[PDB]
């Protein structure tokens, strides 16, 4: 048995940053909305 | 198959069941060149001057 | 009894075709063929998951 594959967009939703994501933040790319996200911005975390 | 009123009571289905779909698809073979695949390119100096 | 075993030499007499051979009506004894599979099946049954 398997539930149907999620129709929620994966490349557009921006989730909370994880510890490993913060560790690899400098190497990781991202969209402008990813860096200046309304919730959990990543540029601020990079500066911190 | 479970239905017993197929034509006795006029239970004509307007959709062909997947079992019949599979049977009809597996009945006949597949044209090998029906699939498109090429990586070498086009024979500029051949593919038209072939054997008669 | 005659219909079941008229000229039956072995229980797997009609197992020449995979569709009959892989039937799970009587059991999985004929399907099991190695101790690795037997141990895997018993481990799955003891853990509660479905038998492969």
């Amino acid at each position: 048995s398997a539930a149907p594959e999620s129709s929620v967009s994966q490349s557009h939703t921006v989730n909370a940053p994880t510890v490993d994501e913060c560790e690899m933040l400098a190497e990781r790319w991202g969209t402008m909305n990813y860096w200046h996200n309304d919730t959990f911005p990543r540029l601020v975390v990079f500066l911190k | 198959s479970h239905r017993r009123d197929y034509i006795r009571m006029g239970y004509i289905p307007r959709y062909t069941p997947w079992e019949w779909i599979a049977i009809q698809e597996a009945d006949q073979p597949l044209i090998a060149e029906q699939i498109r695949q090429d990586n070498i390119g086009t024979s500029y100096f051949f593919s038209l001057n072939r054997y008669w | 009894l005659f219909q079941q075993n008229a000229y039956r030499k072995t229980p797997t007499d009609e197992h020449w075709n995979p569709y009959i051979r892989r039937s799970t009506e009587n059991g999985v004894g004929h399907l099991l063929q190695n101790k690795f599979d037997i141990m895997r099946r018993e481990d799955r049954l003891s853990k509660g998951e479905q038998d492969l």
């Binding site: - | 197929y6 034509i7 006795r8 006029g10 004509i12 | 219909q3 079941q4 075993n5 039956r8 229980p11 009609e14 009506e25 009587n26």
Partner: protein, 74 residues
């Protein structure tokens, strides 16, 4: 030489069933749909016989193998 009058024991275990249907259960039959027929018109060169209960409602069928027979609301 006979030493013991042993009793006969048979390990008969019928735990395997193998029932296969015969080919006469997969033959085709002339199954047909049915509706309340409301009349028949048999038409010939000149003569015609109409046995009609009520009018046609949705269907009218025509056969011409032997006679021109028209089934009304069949």
């Amino acid at each position: 030489m006979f030493l013991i009058h042993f009793v006969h024991y048979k390990t008969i275990l019928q735990k395997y069933t193998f029932k296969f249907k015969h080919i006469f259960l997969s033959i085709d039959k002339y199954n047909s749909l049915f509706f309340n027929i409301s009349g028949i018109l048999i038409w010939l060169n000149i003569i015609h016989i109409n046995i009609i209960l009520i009018k046609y409602s949705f269907f009218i069928l025509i056969n011409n193998f032997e006679y021109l027979i028209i089934l009304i609301s069949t």
